């Protein structure tokens, strides 16, 4: 069974997220878990606090824009760091719920990946291919509450 | 060079920012590689698609709290909507990302390392979060001229 021959990815951006977790002595939850109303409104003070700066950033990117500018790509630091923000705490609101970001993720990549192998309408639409699957989100937690 | 014995399934998943690449590519609109200064219609477009998304995220939580209220015990079950637009919400904030030619993990992994060392600081008596010694804040403009090299 076990000897020395007996024995690892790197980490994903919701793994880190566990380890900030673990770090800010948050003894964040496994497997999916129900939040006291408390976590919940934590976790949307920090999606509206970062939302808003993205929003100001872009808002301010247009302006200049507009006023004719060309942008470098050192312009678009402040816009990144805070969709990474942004990243930080919605990756933070799953992992505090003690669902797998990556495992959610995946399921929503799956259907969008589908859906773009559809046609487009005249207009540039977007349409869903014959025999499109919706993300089946509450089939993934299922999972994840099993293991 | 790759030969009869290579193993073809790579031994670790892509990343959620690779992922999106991968979607971009799909959709007909193949995203550049490096940093790229956008035109004011992407920008207005990744502006709405998070309003829209963080719109739904945050009608999720809403009707969580208010079943709360209510004095409902919320199940695992019940965290699937909500789950669903976070998961919505990082694809358009990495989606966003990928259109500006800058990669997310890049950027991501040095907030983590300024939050992670943030994280190593004490906490005030009310506890407010403090700094360690020797902190250092995310360098996302470093990070930014690196990836057009
Ligand atoms: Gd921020
Ligand atoms: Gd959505």
């Known amino acids: 069974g076990i000897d020395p021959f007996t024995m690892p990815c790197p980490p994903t951006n919701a793994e880190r997220l566990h380890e900030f977790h ?13 939040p006291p109303p408390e976590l919940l409104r934590l976790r949307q003070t920090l999606l509206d606090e970062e ?17 004719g500018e060309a942008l470098s790509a050192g312009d678009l630091a402040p816009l990144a760091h805070e969709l990474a923000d942004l990243l930080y705490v919605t990756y933070g609101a799953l992992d505090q719920l003690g669902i797998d970001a990556d495992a959610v993720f995946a399921e929503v990549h799956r259907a ?10 005249a207009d540039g639409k977007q349409l869903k291919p014959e025999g499109w699957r919706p993300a089946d989100v509450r089939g993934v937690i299922e999972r994840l509450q099993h293991a």
């Open 112 to 121: 969008n990946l589908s859906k773009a192998s559809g046609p487009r309408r």
């Open 51 to 67: 939302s808003a700066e993205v929003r100001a950033e872009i808002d301010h990117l247009l302006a200049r824009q507009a006023a």
């Open 22 to 34: 673990r770090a800010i002595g948050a003894a964040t939850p496994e497997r999916p878990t129900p």
